[PDB]
Design a protein around this ligand. Structure first.
Ligand SMILES: Cc1cnc(N)c2[nH]cnc12
Length: 231
DNA sequence: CCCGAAGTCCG
DNA sequence: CGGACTTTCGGG
C-alpha cells in the first residue's frame, strides 16, 4: 500500500527546499535525537500551505493515517508538520482520541513534540471531560516514560482559573523527587504559569513543600518580585 | 514592534 | 548550583 498521496506530496516539496547547512545546528539543538531537513517554521508552514492549496486537506477519515505516516518519516520537520495538520482537524478531535495522542507522546519523543501535544490537544480534552483525568493521569505518573510524566504535569498549563489546584499539587508531589530535568523543569513551568493566575497559592506551595532547586527557582522567577527575598 | 516560553558557556 | 546570554516561536 503506497504512502498517502498528501504525505508523498509533502515529503517531495519539503525535500526540494531542504537546507543541509541549517539542518546541522537545528539537529544539535535537539541533541541530535533527530535528522532535520533544515526548514524553519515560517517556510515549513508555507510549504504545507502550498500542498493543501494544490491537493486539499485530506478527508477526515484519513486524519490519523496522515499523522502516523508523517510521524514515521525520519526528519523532524515531518512531525512538526503533522502537528500543524492535527490543528487543522481540531474540531474533529475528542475524548476518544486520548490513546492516539498518548501514542504520539511516546513515539519520536522530545520536548518539541510533547509540549505541542499536551497543553493544547490533551488540555482541551480534559477541560471538557475532567472525569476522564483519573483514567489516565495515575498511569502516566507511574510509567517509566518521562514524557507521560511530563504530560501529567503540563496538561493543565493553560487552565488559569479552571486549574484544579488539589490535583496539580498532588501530581507535583508525586514527581517532586524526580532527578529528570524534563520533569523538574515541567514542574517549574506549570507553577510559574499558574502563578500568573494565583500567585499566593504558588508562593505558599513552594515555600512549604519539597521541590528540586530548579523547580522552585523557575516557579518563582517572576513572583519573587512581589514577595521579596528574605535575608 | 514588543515580551515570555529549550540551548551553551562560565564561575 | 545559578547567572548571563543565545535563537526561534507564539502571542499581544
Ligand atoms: C523555551 C525557551 C525559553 N526561553 C528562551 N529564551 C527560549 N528561546 C527559545 N526557546 C526558549
Amino acid at each position: 500500500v503506497p504512502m498517502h498521496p498528501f504525505v508523498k506530496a509533502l515529503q517531495e516539496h519539503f525535500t526540494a527546499h531542504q537546507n543541509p547547512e541549517k539542518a546541522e545546528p537545528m539537529a544539535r539543538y535537539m541533541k541530535n535525537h533527530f535528522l532535520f531537513l533544515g526548514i524553519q517554521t515560517p517556510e515549513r508552514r508555507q510549504l504545507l500551505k502550498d500542498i493543501i492549496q494544490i491537493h486539499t486537506l485530506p478527508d477526515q477519515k484519513d486524519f490519523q493515517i496522515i499523522i502516523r505516516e508523517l510521524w514515521d518519516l525520519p526528519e523532524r520537520e515531518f512531525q512538526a508538520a503533522a502537528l500543524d495538520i492535527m490543528q487543522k482537524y481540531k474540531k474533529h478531535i475528542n475524548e476518544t482520541h486520548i490513546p492516539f495522542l498518548e501514542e504520539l507522546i511516546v513515539t519520536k519523543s522530545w520536548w518539541d513534540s510533547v509540549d505541542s501535544i499536551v497543553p493544547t490537544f490533551l488540555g482541551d480534552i480534559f477541560l471538557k471531560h475532567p472525569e476522564l483525568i483519573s483514567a489516565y493521569i495515575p498511569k502516566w505518573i507511574a510509567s517509566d516514560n518521562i514524557w507521560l510524566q511530563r504530560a501529567a504535569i503540563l496538561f493543565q498549563l493553560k487552565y488559569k482559573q479552571k486549574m484544579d489546584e488539589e490535583l496539580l499539587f498532588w501530581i507535583i508531589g508525586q514527581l517532586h523527587s524526580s532527578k529528570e530535568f524534563f520533569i523538574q523543569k515541567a514542574i517549574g513551568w506549570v507553577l510559574r504559569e499558574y502563578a500568573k493566575t494565583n500567585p499566593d497559592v504558588v508562593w505558599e506551595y513552594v515555600q512549604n513543600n519539597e521541590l528540586a532547586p530548579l523547580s522552585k527557582r523557575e516557579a518563582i522567577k517572576h513572583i519573587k518580585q512581589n514577595y521579596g527575598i528574605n535575608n
